[PDB]
Short mmCIF file of C-alpha atoms in Angstrom, two decimals:
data_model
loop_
_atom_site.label_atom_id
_atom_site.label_comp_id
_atom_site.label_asym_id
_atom_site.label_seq_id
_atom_site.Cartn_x
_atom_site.Cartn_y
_atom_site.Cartn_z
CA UNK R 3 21.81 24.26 -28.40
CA UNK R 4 19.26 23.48 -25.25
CA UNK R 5 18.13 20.40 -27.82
CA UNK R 6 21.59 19.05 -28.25
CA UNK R 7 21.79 18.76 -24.28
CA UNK R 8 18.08 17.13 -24.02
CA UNK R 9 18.92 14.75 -27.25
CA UNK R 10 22.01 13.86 -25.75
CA UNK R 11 20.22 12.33 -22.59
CA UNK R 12 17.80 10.84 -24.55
CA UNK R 13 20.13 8.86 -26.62
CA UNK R 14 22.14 7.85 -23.63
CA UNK R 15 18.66 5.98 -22.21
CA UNK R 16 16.38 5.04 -25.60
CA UNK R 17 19.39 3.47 -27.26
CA UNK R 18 18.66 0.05 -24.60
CA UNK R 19 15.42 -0.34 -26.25
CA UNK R 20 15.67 -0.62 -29.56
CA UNK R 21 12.14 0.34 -31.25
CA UNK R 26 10.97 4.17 -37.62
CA UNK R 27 8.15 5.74 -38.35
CA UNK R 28 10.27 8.24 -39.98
CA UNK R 29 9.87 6.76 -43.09
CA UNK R 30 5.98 7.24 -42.91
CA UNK R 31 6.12 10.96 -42.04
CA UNK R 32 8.44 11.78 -44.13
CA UNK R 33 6.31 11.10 -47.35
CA UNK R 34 3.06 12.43 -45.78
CA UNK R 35 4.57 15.81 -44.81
CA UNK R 36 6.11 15.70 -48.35
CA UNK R 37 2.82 15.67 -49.28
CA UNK R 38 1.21 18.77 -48.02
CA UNK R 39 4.17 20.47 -47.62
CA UNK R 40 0.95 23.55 -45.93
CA UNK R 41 1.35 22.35 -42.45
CA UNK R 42 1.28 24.55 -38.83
CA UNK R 43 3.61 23.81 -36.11
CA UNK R 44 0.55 22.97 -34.11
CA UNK R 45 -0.52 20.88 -36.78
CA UNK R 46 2.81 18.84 -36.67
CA UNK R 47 2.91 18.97 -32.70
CA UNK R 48 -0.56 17.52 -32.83
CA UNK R 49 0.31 14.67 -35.67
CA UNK R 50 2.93 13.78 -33.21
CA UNK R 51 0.74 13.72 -30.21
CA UNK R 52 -1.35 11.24 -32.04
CA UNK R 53 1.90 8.95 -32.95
CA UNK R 54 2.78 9.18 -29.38
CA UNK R 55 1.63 10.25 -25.85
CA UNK R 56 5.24 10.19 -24.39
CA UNK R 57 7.32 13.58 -24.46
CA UNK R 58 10.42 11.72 -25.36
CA UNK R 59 9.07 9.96 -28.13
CA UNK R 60 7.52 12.69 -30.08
CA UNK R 61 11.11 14.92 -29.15
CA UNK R 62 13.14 11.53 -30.53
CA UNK R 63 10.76 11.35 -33.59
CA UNK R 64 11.76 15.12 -34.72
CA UNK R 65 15.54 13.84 -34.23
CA UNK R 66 14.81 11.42 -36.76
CA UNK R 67 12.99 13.77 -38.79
CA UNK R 68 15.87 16.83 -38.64
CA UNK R 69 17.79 13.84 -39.55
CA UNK R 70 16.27 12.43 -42.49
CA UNK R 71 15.76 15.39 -44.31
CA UNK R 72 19.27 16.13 -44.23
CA UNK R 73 19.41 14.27 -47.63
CA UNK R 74 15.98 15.58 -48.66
CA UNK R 75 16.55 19.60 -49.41
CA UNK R 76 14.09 19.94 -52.06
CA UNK R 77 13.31 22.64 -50.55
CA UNK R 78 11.44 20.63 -48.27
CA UNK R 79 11.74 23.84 -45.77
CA UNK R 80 9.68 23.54 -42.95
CA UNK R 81 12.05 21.61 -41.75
CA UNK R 82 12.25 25.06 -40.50
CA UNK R 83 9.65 23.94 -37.87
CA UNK R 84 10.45 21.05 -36.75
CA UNK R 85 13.66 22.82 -35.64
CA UNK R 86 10.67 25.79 -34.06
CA UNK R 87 9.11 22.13 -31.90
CA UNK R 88 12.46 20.89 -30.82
CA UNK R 89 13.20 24.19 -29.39
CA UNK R 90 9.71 24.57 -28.00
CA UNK R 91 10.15 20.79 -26.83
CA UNK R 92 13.11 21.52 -25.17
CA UNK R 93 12.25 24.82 -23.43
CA UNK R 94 9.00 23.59 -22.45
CA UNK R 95 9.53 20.00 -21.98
CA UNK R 96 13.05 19.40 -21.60
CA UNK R 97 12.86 17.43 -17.80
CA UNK R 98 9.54 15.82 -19.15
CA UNK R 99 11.55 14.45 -21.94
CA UNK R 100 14.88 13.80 -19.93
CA UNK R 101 12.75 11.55 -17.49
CA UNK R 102 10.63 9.84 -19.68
CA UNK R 103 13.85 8.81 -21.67
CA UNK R 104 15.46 7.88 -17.96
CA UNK R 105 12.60 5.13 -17.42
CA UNK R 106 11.60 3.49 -20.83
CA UNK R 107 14.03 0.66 -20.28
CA UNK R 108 12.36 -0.34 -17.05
CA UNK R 109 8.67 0.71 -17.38
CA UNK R 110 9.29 -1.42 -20.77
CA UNK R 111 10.40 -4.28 -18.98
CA UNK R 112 7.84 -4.11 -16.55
CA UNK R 113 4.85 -3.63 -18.47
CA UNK R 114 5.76 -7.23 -20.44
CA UNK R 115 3.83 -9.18 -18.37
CA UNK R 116 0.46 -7.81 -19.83
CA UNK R 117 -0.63 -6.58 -16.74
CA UNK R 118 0.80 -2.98 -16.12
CA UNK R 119 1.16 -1.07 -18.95
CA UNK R 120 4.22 1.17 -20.50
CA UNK R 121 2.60 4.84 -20.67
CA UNK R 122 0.73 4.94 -17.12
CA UNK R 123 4.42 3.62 -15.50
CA UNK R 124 6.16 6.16 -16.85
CA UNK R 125 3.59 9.00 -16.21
CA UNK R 126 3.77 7.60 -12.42
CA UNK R 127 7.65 7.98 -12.14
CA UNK R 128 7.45 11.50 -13.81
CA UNK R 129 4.64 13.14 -11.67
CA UNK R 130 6.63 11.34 -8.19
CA UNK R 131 9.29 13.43 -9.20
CA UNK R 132 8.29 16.85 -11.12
CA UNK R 133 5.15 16.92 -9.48
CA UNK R 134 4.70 15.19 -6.02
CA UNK R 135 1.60 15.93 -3.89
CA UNK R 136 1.87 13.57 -1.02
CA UNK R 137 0.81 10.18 -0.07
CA UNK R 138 -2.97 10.35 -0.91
CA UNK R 139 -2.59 11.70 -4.42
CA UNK R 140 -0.12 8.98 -5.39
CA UNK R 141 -2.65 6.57 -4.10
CA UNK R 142 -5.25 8.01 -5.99
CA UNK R 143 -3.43 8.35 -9.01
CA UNK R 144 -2.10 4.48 -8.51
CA UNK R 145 -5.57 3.29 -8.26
CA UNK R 146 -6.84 5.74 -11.48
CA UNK R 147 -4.04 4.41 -13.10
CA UNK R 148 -3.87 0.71 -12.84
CA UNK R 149 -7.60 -0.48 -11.82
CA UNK R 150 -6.64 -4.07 -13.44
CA UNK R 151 -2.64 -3.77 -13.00
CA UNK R 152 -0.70 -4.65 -9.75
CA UNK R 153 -0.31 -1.82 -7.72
CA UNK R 154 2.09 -3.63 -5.62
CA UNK R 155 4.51 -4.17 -8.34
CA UNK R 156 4.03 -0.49 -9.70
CA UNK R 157 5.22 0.37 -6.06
CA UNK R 158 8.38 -1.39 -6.38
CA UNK R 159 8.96 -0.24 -9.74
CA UNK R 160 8.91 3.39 -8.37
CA UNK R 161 10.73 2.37 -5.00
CA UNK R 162 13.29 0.42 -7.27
CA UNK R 163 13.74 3.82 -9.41
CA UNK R 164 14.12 6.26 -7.10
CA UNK R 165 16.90 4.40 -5.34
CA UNK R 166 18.92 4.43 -8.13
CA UNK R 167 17.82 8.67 -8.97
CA UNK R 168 19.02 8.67 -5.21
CA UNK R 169 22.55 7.74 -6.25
CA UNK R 170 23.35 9.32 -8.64
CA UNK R 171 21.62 13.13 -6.87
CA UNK R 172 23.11 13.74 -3.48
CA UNK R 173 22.65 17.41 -3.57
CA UNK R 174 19.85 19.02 -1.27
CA UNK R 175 16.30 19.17 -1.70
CA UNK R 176 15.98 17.27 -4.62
CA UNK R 177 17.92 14.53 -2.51
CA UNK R 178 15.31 15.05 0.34
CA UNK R 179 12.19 15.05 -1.97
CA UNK R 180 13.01 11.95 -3.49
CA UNK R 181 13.46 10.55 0.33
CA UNK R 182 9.98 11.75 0.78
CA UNK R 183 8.40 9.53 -2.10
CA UNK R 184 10.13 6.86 -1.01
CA UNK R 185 9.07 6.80 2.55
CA UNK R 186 5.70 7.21 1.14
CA UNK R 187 5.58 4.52 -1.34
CA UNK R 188 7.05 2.64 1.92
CA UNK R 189 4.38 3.57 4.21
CA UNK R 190 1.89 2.41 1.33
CA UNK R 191 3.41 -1.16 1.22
CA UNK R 192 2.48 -0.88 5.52
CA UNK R 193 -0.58 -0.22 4.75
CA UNK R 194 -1.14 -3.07 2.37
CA UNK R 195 -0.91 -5.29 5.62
CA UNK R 196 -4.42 -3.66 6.53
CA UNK R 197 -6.14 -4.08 3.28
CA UNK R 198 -8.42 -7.07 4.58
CA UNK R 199 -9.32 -5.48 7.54
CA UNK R 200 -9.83 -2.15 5.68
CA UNK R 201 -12.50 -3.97 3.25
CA UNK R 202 -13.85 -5.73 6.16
CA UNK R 203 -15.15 -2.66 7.48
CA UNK R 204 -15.89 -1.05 3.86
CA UNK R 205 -18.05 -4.32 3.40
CA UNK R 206 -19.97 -3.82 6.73
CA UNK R 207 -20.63 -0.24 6.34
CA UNK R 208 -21.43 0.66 2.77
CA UNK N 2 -20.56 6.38 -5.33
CA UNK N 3 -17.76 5.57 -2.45
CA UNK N 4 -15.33 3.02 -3.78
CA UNK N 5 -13.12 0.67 -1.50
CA UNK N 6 -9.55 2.30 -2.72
CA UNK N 7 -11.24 5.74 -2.04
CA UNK N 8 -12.13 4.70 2.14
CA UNK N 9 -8.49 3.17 1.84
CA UNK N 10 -7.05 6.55 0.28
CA UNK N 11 -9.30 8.27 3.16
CA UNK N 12 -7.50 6.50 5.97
CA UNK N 13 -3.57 6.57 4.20
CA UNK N 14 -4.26 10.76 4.13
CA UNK N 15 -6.04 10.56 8.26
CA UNK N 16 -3.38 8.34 9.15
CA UNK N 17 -0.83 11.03 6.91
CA UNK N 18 -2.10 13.89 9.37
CA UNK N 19 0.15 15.55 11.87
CA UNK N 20 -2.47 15.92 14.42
CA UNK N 21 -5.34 14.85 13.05
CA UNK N 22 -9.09 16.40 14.92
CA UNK N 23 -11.66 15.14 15.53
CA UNK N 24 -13.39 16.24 12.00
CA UNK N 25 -10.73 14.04 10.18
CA UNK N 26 -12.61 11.26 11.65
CA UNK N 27 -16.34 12.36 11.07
CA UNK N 28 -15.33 12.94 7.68
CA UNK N 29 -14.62 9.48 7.26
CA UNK N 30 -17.97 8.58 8.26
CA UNK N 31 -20.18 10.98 6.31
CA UNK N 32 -18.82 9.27 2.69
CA UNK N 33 -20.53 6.46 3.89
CA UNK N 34 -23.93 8.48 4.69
CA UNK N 35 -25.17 6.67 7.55
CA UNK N 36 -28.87 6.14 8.06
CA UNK N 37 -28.68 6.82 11.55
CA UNK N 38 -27.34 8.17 14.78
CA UNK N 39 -26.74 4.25 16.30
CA UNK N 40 -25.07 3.48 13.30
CA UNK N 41 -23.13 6.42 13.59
CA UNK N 42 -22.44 5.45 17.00
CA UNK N 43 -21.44 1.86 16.10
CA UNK N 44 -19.65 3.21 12.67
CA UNK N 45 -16.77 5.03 15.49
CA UNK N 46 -16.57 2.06 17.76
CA UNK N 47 -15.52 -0.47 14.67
CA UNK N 48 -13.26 2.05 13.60
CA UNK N 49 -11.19 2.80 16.99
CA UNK N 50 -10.85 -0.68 17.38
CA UNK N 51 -10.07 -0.97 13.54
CA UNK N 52 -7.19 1.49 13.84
CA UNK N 53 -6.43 0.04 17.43
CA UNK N 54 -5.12 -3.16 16.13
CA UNK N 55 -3.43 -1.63 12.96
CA UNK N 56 0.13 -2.41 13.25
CA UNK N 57 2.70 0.19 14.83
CA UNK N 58 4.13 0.70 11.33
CA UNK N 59 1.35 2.09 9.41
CA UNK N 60 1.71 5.26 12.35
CA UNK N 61 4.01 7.85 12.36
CA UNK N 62 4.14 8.27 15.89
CA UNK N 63 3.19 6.38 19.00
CA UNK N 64 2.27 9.93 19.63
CA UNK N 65 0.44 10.43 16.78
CA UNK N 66 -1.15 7.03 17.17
CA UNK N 67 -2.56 7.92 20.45
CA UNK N 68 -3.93 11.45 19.18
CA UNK N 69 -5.79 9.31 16.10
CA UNK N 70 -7.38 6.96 18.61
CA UNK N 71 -8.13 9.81 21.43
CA UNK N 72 -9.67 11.48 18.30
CA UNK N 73 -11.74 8.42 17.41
CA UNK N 74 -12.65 8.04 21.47
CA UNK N 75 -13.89 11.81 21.15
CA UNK N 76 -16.07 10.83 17.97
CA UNK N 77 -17.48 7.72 19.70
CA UNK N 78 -18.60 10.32 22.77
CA UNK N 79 -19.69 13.19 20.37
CA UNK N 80 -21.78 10.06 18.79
CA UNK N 81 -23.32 9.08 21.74
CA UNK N 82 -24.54 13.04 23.19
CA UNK N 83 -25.52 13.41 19.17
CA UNK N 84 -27.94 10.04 19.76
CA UNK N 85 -28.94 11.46 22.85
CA UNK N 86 -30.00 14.78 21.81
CA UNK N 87 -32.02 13.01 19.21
CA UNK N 88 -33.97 11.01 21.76
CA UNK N 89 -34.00 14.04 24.68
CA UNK N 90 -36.85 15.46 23.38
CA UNK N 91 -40.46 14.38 22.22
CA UNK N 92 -41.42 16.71 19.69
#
């Protein structure tokens, strides 16, 4: 109902990458068949850190043991997480489905990797805190990756959310990161002189 | 422990400020617990002049450009009366 809407958007996005386990949980939970909801919440935690993947992962799952009734019931609750998943987690999910394709092809080069990229473009827009917390979560994020590149990544984006949102004051909060994360490429013009005087002083 | 992206986070969020004090800018100098008043003293001379020749872009404001460096002027003289008071009497 609320999980056909979220699955729906998820599909849309995770269909350009291309990447079963479902195979593998399917004969575990099989065996076992004693399991809590926050046991299977946790498994899937474990599997995956990303929202979108655990929520696609109980698709599968719903799926699969369409063919396997035996009663093999507790499928009863992995209906109970998609429903929790999609109350609790549906914009989580919707956005970390949204950016896979691109934090993907991004983190290829070795250098910045999938999960911290999509975290980044998630907490820019669900939970944005200024200028100085994205910095600091940049820098906590990617202290071997290329910040610079993450930037674009997130200014690249959040042109196209822009778009596609012309509303109000989501329209204007995205505006807000993006002036930000175009402020921060300014200030990489200082960095020398900034570590000049770091170097002097400390 | 003050790391190089932290002093460079310190100055994005000063520079982020509507109307920064002068506070914002002593604050930048005690992370770097100076052994010192002349150091102190030198510490918001290097950084006026540091922010001075930052390009207009990294401002939001000319106005708020001139308050930050006003602000850093006012830490420079607070510095100075500070280094004074330390040497005005004999104890």
């Amino acid at each position: 109902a609320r999980v056909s809407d979220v699955e729906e958007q998820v599909n849309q996005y995770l269909s350009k990458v291309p990447e079963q386990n479902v195979s593998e949980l399917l004969s575990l939970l099989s065996n076992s068949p004693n399991i809590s909801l926050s046991q299977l919440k946790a498994y899937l935690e474990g599997k995956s850190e990303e929202p979108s993947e655990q929520f696609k992962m109980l698709c599968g799952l719903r799926d699969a043991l369409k063919g396997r009734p035996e009663l093999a019931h507790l499928s009863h609750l992995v209906e109970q997480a998609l429903v929790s998943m999609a109350e609790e987690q549906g914009e989580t999910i919707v956005l970390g489905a949204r950016i896979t394709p691109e934090a993907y092809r991004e983190s290829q080069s070795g250098v910045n990797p999938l999960q911290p990229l999509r975290d980044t473009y998630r907490d820019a827009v669900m939970g944005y805190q200024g200028i100085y917390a994205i910095w600091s979560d940049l820098q906590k994020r990617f202290p071997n990756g290329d910040i610079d590149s993450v930037i674009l990544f997130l200014q690249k984006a959040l042109s196209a959310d822009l778009q596609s949102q012309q509303s109000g004051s989501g329209r204007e909060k995205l505006g807000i990161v993006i002036s930000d994360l175009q402020k921060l490429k300014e200030f990489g013009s200082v960095s020398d002189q900034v570590k000049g005087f770091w170097q002097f002083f400390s | 422990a003050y790391d190089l992206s932290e002093f460079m986070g310190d100055i994005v969020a000063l520079v982020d400020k509507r109307w920064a004090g002068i506070h914002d800018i002593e604050h930048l100098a005690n992370a770097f617990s100076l052994p010192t008043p002349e150091i102190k003293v030198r510490f918001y001379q290097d950084l006026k002049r540091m922010f001075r020749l930052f390009p207009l872009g990294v401002f939001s404001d000319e106005e708020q450009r001139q308050n930050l460096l006003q602000m850093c002027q006012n830490a420079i003289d607070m510095a100075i009366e500070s280094e004074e008071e330390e040497l005005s009497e004999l104890d």
